[PDB]
Curated annotation (Swiss-Prot), chains A, B:
The keyword Coiled coil does not apply. Changing residue 86 to A: Decreased zinc-binding. The modification N-acetylserine is found at residue 2. Small zinc- and- and calcium-binding protein that is highly expressed in astrocytes and constitutes one of the most abundant soluble proteins in brain. Weakly binds calcium but binds zinc very tightly-distinct binding sites with different affinities exist for both ions on each monomer. Physiological concentrations of potassium ion antagonize the binding of both divalent cations, especially affecting high-affinity calcium-binding sites. Acts as a neurotrophic factor that promotes astrocytosis and axonal proliferation. This is Protein S100-B. InterPro entries: EF-hand-dom_pair, EF_Hand_1_Ca_BS, EF_hand_dom, S100-B, S100/CaBP7/8-like_CS, S100_Ca-bd_sub. Ca(2+) 2 binds at residues 62, 64, 66, 68, 73. Its main location: cytoplasm. Ca(2+) 1 binds at residues 19, 22, 27, 32.
Length: 92, 92
């Protein structure tokens, strides 16, 4: 019944879901990760002030596009992008 | 209407709330951060296999206990701890 719990804990669910799709149940794919952000989230993205944060995770993302991601990797990857844009509390 | 959106985006809300408590509205406090994790989350914690992940963020947390945290800092800090415990998809 809290914010970080229902929300943060909900993230742990996405991995059990998206990753629970195919046989694997503890490893994602650089493509399902880049898609996880530009698909599930993709909404408050406008100019992206942290071009280095999104270009850093998006770079390693398009750099391999041939391996799989982990749970701590797709986790620290979804947070950096959700914090890239400077305006995150102002949606007028 | 997605998992990463309602969840991940919900996190951006916690900062606008917990931090929106006092005058500041874009900076948390090492104490409200450590409390943000052990207060809002605190639930699926059992043995914590990543004693280094929780001891790493919990160390810098109890190391300063005198400054304030940012939004990308409290963000990458809440993800590392929610991924510290190895068992995150098995709650029997």
């Amino acid at each position: 019944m809290s914010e970080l719990e229902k929300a943060m804990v909900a993230l742990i669910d996405v991995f059990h879901q998206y990753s629970g799709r195919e046989g694997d149940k503890h490893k994602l794919k650089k493509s399902e990760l880049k898609e996880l952000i530009n698909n599930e989230l993709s909404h408050f993205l406008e100019e992206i002030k942290e071009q280095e944060v999104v270009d850093k995770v998006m770079e390693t993302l398009d750099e391999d596009g041939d391996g799989e991601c982990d749970f701590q990797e797709f986790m620290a990857f979804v947070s950096m992008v959700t914090t890239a844009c400077h305006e995150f509390f102002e949606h007028e």
